[PDB]
Amino acid sequence: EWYGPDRPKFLGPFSEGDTPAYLTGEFPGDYGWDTAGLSADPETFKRYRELELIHARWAMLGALGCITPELLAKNGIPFGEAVWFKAGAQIFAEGGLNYLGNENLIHAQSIIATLAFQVVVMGLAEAYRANGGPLGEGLDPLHPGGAFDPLGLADDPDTFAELKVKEIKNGRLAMFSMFGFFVQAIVTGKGPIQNLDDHLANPTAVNAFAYATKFTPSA
Amino acid sequence: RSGGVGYRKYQGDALWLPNTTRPEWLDGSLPGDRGFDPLGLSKPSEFVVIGVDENDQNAAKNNKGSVEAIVQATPDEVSSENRLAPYSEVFGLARFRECELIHGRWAMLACLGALVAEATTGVSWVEAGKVELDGASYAGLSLPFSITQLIWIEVILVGGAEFYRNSETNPEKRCYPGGVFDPLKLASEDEERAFRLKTAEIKHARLAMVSFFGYGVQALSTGEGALGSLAKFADGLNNG
Amino acid sequence: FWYGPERPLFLGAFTGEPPSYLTGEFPGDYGWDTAGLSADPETFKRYRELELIHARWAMLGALGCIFPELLGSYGVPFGEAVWFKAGAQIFQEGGLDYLGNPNLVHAQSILAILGTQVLLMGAIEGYRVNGGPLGEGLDKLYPGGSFDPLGLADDPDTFAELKVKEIKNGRLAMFSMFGFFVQAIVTGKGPLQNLSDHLANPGTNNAFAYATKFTPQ
Amino acid sequence: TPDSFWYGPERPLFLGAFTGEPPSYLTGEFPGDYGWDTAGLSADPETFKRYRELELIHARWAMLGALGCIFPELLGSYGVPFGEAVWFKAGAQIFQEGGLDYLGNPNLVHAQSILAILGTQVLLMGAIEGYRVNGGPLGEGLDKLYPGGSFDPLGLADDPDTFAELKVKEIKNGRLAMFSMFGFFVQAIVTGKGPLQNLSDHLANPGTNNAFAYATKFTPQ
Ligand code: CHL
Ligand code: CHL
Ligand code: CHL
Numbered sequence: 001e002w003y004g005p006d007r008p009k010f011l012g013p014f015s016e017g018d019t020p021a022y023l024t025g026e027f028p029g030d031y032g033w034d035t036a037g038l039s040a041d042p043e044t045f046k047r048y049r050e051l052e053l054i055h056a057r058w059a060m061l062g063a064l065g066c067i068t069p070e071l072l073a074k075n076g077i078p079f080g081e082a083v084w085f086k087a088g089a090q091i092f093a094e095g096g097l098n099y100l101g102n103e104n105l106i107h108a109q110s111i112i113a114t115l116a117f118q119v120v121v122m123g124l125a126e127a128y129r130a131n132g133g134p135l136g137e138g139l140d141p142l143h144p145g146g147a148f149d150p151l152g153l154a155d156d157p158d159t160f161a162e163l164k165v166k167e168i169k170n171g172r173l174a175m176f177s178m179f180g181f182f183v184q185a186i187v188t189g190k191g192p193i194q195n196l197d198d199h200l201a202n203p204t205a206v207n208a209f210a211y212a213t214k215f216t217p218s219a
Numbered sequence: 220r221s222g223g224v225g226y227r228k229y230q231g232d233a234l235w236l237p238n239t240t241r242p243e244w245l246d247g248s249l250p251g252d253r254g255f256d257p258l259g260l261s262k263p264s265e266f267v268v269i270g271v272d273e274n275d276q277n278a279a280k281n282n283k284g285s286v287e288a289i290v291q292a293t294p295d296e297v298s299s300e301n302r303l304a305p306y307s308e309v310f311g312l313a314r315f316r317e318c319e320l321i322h323g324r325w326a327m328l329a330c331l332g333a334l335v336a337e338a339t340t341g342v343s344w345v346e347a348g349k350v351e352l353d354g355a356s357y358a359g360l361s362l363p364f365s366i367t368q369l370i371w372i373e374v375i376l377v378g379g380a381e382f383y384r385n386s387e388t389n390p391e392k393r394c395y396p397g398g399v400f401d402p403l404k405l406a407s408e409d410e411e412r413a414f415r416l417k418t419a420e421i422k423h424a425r426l427a428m429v430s431f432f433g434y435g436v437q438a439l440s441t442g443e444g445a446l447g448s449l450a451k452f453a454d455g456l457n458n459g
Numbered sequence: 460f461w462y463g464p465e466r467p468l469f470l471g472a473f474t475g476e477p478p479s480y481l482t483g484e485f486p487g488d489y490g491w492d493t494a495g496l497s498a499d500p501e502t503f504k505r506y507r508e509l510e511l512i513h514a515r516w517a518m519l520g521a522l523g524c525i526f527p528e529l530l531g532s533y534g535v536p537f538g539e540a541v542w543f544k545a546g547a548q549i550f551q552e553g554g555l556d557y558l559g560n561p562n563l564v565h566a567q568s569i570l571a572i573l574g575t576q577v578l579l580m581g582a583i584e585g586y587r588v589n590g591g592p593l594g595e596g597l598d599k600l601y602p603g604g605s606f607d608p609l610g611l612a613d614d615p616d617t618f619a620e621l622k623v624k625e626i627k628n629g630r631l632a633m634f635s636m637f638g639f640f641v642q643a644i645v646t647g648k649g650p651l652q653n654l655s656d657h658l659a660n661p662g663t664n665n666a667f668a669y670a671t672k673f674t675p676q
Numbered sequence: 677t678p679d680s681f682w683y684g685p686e687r688p689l690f691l692g693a694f695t696g697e698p699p700s701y702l703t704g705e706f707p708g709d710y711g712w713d714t715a716g717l718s719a720d721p722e723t724f725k726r727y728r729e730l731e732l733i734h735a736r737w738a739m740l741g742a743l744g745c746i747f748p749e750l751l752g753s754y755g756v757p758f759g760e761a762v763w764f765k766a767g768a769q770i771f772q773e774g775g776l777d778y779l780g781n782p783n784l785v786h787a788q789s790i791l792a793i794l795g796t797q798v799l800l801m802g803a804i805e806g807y808r809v810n811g812g813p814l815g816e817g818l819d820k821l822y823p824g825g826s827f828d829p830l831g832l833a834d835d836p837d838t839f840a841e842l843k844v845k846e847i848k849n850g851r852l853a854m855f856s857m858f859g860f861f862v863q864a865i866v867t868g869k870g871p872l873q874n875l876s877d878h879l880a881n882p883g884t885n886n887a888f889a890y891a892t893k894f895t896p897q
């Protein structure tokens with residue numbers, strides 16, 4: 001289970017009649033769904049695992065940071081308009097951009113300062129992720145360990161090979177939920193907790209089909 | 220472990236009398252066999268064939284036809300070059316088995332339909348005609364068909380079923396075809412387990428035909444349907 | 460996955476030590492005999508004779524409590540759709556109308572009801588012990604014969620898991636009827652009537668509202 | 677392979693005489709091989725197979741889509757009382773008060789709940805797309821994209837030359853539709869009208885109802 005040629009797959013009982021021969025079960029997260037045949041080259045399939053895992057990690061950081069300014073908004077925390085798809089414009093408010101509500105916090109007005117600081121920080125940090133450097137060099141490009149596993153959890157290689165599957169499954173629906181949050185903000189124009197409050201107010205009447213005739217081309 | 224108490228084994232075959240014998244042409248190979256055949260309707264009825272006579276207008280005497288041969292009856296040759304009279308005999312046991320079953324399968328499909336249609340709509344099966352001659356309804360929902368459209372749809376569709384049913388040539392397989400008609404594959408294997416399935420269908424066939432002949436006769440007297448003529452009996456029985 | 464030592468137990472992954480006399484051989488073996496009632500290998504048979512008859516008599520019971528009240532909500536004029544009020548229908552002058560229909564059964568004499576039940580149930584539970592014209596010398600719990608007409612119990616391999624599905628569905632039904640007796644004494648309403656009131660407002664129509672119902676003095 | 681004019685090295689090419697020579701893996705034994713893989717997406721023969729069921733199913737949905745988008749629109753202009761005849765405005769017929777009456781006829785389908793439509797679409801389209809991958813009662817071990825048998829009832833794909841000829845007709849009728857069904861999308865975003873309403877206007881004045889009258893529509897402003 002979870003590895004070998006007897007792993008669960010992406011269609012269940014129907015899935016065994018078309019599964020790619022180059023997908024075997026030797027990598028975590030193998031459910032046998034490469035019907036478009038994009039990763040048949042084993043060199044590109046080495047790269048697409050790296051692209052998938054990094055995208056998942058920004059998604060798990062991303063999806064948690066989209067709702068924590070809104071759950072705190074309903075628990076009586078003073079924000080200046082904490083909804084994720086328009087909280088970037090808070091820096092053009094007259095009080096700068098205070099962090100929680102307090103002026104003795106960060107208080108950033110010039111975005112040119114915080115932008116150019118980021119690209120130098122993230123420039124070397126993303127450069128060190130590929131080549132290595134001060135937090136180790138000769139390490140696995142996906143799971144280096146050591147400096148990024150302080151708590152010793154990446155031991156017991158029958159457990160470490162299963163926390164990967166928890167790493168990517170928790171990662172995949174976070175990628176699927178940020179693709180949620182994007183579209184539910186484009187169409188509706190409100191925060192996802194406000195959407196989740198409004199679906200629970202009336203689930204039969206208030207759902208996505210109320211917004212189905214929004215993009216009809218009037219010409 | 221066992222104990223024979225509260226019942227008796229009787230060592231027998233459960234004929235339609237508690238003690239008579241079995242007629243000769245009935246043998247226990249069929250599921251419905253309880254030895255019930257008065258009037259000899261499935262006896263092997265041998266014939267005799269008479270030659271044709273003389274028309275022969277340019278002759279002296281046009282005699283008569285006379286006896287040629289006493290042939291024996293050969294039932295259930297269902298050779299399919301005929302297509303309008305397949306069996307070699309009208310009075311053959313294998314044809315009446317099939318004629319009992321198809322009478323059975325229409326009956327119990329109709330006896331249940333005579334009640335479920337009434338239990339929702341309230342229209343009895345006797346008066347189901349006029350009430351849809353004006354409007355085609357089903358479970359209180361309207362349907363777009365005229366009654367002229369219903370007959371052409373009926374004759375064309377259920378025609379081809381009754382033509383395809385007449386395409387099989389094996390006299391057992393005309394009764395129980397299976398194949399596509401047994402998707403669950405219940406009576407397809409385990410021939411003893413299939414046999415008590417077959418005795419359950421004929422008992423539900425025999426009980427159906429009597430029950431449907433029950434509906435019509437009491438609908439001729441009373442003029443009332445299946446369940447409306449049931450409540451009339453319980454009307455006076457409860458109060459009186 | 461169900462038999463032997465690599466079976467699940469009542470405490471799951473953190474189960475530690477089951478009792479010794481539960482080897483993963485019989486259905487419903489989750490190793491939950493922490494009080495140790497059935498260390499006797501003879502008496503443990505008698506409870507497996509007795510758990511299952513409780514299990515089968517409770518699975519058919521649940522469609523006698525849920526099912527008339529469920530049909531009563533969808534337009535069938537029952538005499539008493541609530542199941543614990545159903546016995547009192549024979550003492551009203553309309554009588555026990557089956558499905559609320561007067562031209563059906565229409566019971567009037569309550570003493571004549573069980574006057575013929577005892578003659579049947581006496582003859583039908585005595586068949587389960589021994590004898591009977593259905594199956595003479597057969598298994599005490601799984602005879603097949605003509606209790607299994609369709610033949611879903613043909614191979615001995617698949618027959619083991621249907622015995623498992625019989626008892627897990629069965630223990631689940633017996634759980635609901637230690638339920639069903641409490642929620643009728645406490646509320647006085649039907650079981651789906653309590654379910655219809657909980658979906659309207661869950662945080663108020665739960666059992667903590669009735670927490671002071673048996674208050675003394 | 678016979679001399680069949682569509683398979684092999686003498687096959688016609690997507691630029692005519694100016695093509696020269698096809699890529700080294702498009703050798704001309706699959707339908708619709710005009711030798712056009714200039715970007716080279718399918719050099720891997722494992723990957724090149726994966727685009728062919730990806731192309732053919734797109735064709736077998738678009739050919740239904742090309743006929744399906746205009747045929748209620750065509751009959752709508754001759755007095756059939758549809759709710760909406762335009763294909764991109766016909767999905768919102770479930771929200772009107774009469775329900776989605778099929779053919780504009782109230783005594784037909786009469787759908788009310790959009791959830792009930794979608795609830796039974798997934799439970800059916802899951803099973804038959806599940807059957808298309810493998811299994812299913814209509815054929816167990818067959819081809820992934822030419823199953824035949826119960827999916828060729830009239831028996832007109834039996835001769836290996838005629839059946840190899842009709843595969844060329846299927847994909848070319850398909851590639852005509854996929855290009856054209858792409859056209860329905862763009863000339864509905866731009867023009868805003870039904871696709872025959874675009875056609876009956878271009879037949880009105882062809883010099884002024886062409887696409888250049890909509891060229892300044894998306895000016896940055
Ligand atoms: C046995 C039934 C079964 C079925 C039918 C599926 C089906 C699916 N699984 Mg699988 N699974 C099934 C069993 C199991 N899955 C999994 C584990 C997984 C995982 C981890 C994943 C899947 C995923 C998928 C999807 C991949 C195929 C696809 O991309 O659809 C493409 C085709 C469609 C989506 C058709 C569209 C249907 C819908 C009606 C569209 C509606 C149209 C709009 C209303 C209008 C259009 C809008 C316009 C305006 C732009 C698909 C939904 C993947 C997934 O989640 O992708 C999202 C995935 O990551 N499955 C397990 C556990 C082992 C199963 C147990 O047996
Ligand atoms: C690892 C975590 C785990 C834990 C803690 C349990 C615990 C339990 N399992 Mg197990 N399971 C666990 C894993 C798993 N179980 C199962 C499958 C099963 C089954 C089929 C069953 C159990 C059952 C049990 C119970 C065994 C003893 C009992 O009856 O307690 C009961 C006593 C208590 C829980 C404590 C007291 C009850 C209450 C919480 C106190 C609250 C106080 C009241 C509010 C006060 C009332 C006021 C006044 C008036 C009195 C117990 C609830 C049995 C069960 O369901 O029993 C009902 C059972 O049939 N488990 C699987 C699937 C393989 C597991 C997977 O890991
Ligand atoms: C054997 C199962 C059985 C049970 C548990 C009941 C119990 C009930 N009957 Mg019923 N009956 C049962 C079968 C039969 N009854 C009747 C004839 C009647 C009549 C005429 C009436 C009832 C009424 C009632 C209800 C009494 C209200 C009440 O108990 O207060 C609330 C308390 C509870 C519901 C707790 C019940 C739990 C129970 C005491 C423990 C379960 C174990 C039992 C001791 C086992 C049963 C007997 C054993 C020895 C087999 C209640 C639903 C009355 C009624 O419905 O009016 C409202 C009524 O008038 N019953 C017949 C035909 C003789 C039955 C056939 O066996």
Ligand code: CHL
Pocket residue numbers: 209212213215216217763764765766767768769770790793794797861864865
């Ligand atoms: C099969 C693909 C499919 C497509 C392309 C559409 C497209 C549409 N639907 Mg529709 N639907 C589709 C399936 C289904 N729909 C519905 C139920 C509805 C309802 C109730 C409504 C619509 C509406 C619409 C229209 C939105 C107006 C618009 O987009 O502006 C113009 C722009 C375009 C037409 C360009 C669109 C092209 C598209 C974005 C690219 C095509 C690729 C897609 C991404 C593929 C999607 C398939 C996926 C889901 C597997 C649009 C034509 C609304 C409507 O009726 O509008 C008035 C509406 O109210 N649909 C169901 C039943 C659940 C479907 C089943 O699969």
Ligand code: CLA
Pocket residue numbers: 737740741743744745747748758759760761766767769776777778779780784785
């Ligand atoms: C890819 C295929 C496709 C898809 C998804 C659609 C999608 C759609 N079409 Mg289009 N269509 C297509 C291809 C397609 N079309 C093609 C190729 C044709 C040409 C034949 C049509 C012709 C067409 C018409 C004429 C109409 C639609 C309509 C519709 C809409 C609803 C469909 C519906 O009501 O189904 C329901 C249909 C069925 C379930 C099958 C037909 C069943 C009929 C009613 C006979 C009933 C059978 C039987 C007699 C009754 C059963 C027995 C009963 C008595 C118990 C939807 C937007 C309707 C609409 O409003 O769009 C504008 C509409 O009126 N379609």
Ligand SMILES: CC1=C[C@H](O)CC(C)(C)[C@H]1/C=C/C(C)=C/C=C/C(C)=C/C=C/C=C(C)/C=C/C=C(C)/C=C/C1=C(C)C[C@H](O)CC1(C)C
Pocket residue numbers: 491492493494495496513516517519520521522523524541542543545633634636637
């Ligand atoms: C195992 C173990 C282990 C450990 O170690 C120890 C211990 C704990 C001791 C143990 C446990 C045990 C248990 C849990 C038990 C329980 C049981 C139950 C509950 C049963 C039920 C049981 C139940 C039952 C029978 C029931 C049945 C029922 C019925 C018939 C009913 C009937 C009816 C109906 C239909 C309805 C209507 O209105 C009427 C009447 C008539 C009323």
